[PDB]
Amino acid sequence: DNFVMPRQRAVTVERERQAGKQRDAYYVTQRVNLQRYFENGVVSGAYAA
């Protein structure tokens, strides 16, 4: 529960038809992040060094 991902825009596939070049360009963008409410709730384990 401590960690939540925020999002401004989802995954969007917008196509652009270039003409002088016969190719069609596809653009996919996304606005996301990962933050936690408070500074706790995650613990890591590592080998003995």
Added chain:
Amino acid sequence: DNFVMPRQRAVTVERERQAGKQRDAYYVTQRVNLQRYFENGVVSGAYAA
């Protein structure tokens, strides 16, 4: 009446979508000029010195 408004095209708004930069480009243009039939008809009063 000595002055005129030579005009070719009026004020036009062109909307362009540039998907590569994901900008909306807006262009406004017009073609105008100022002319007089004869080389006279004006007078201006300036300050001293």
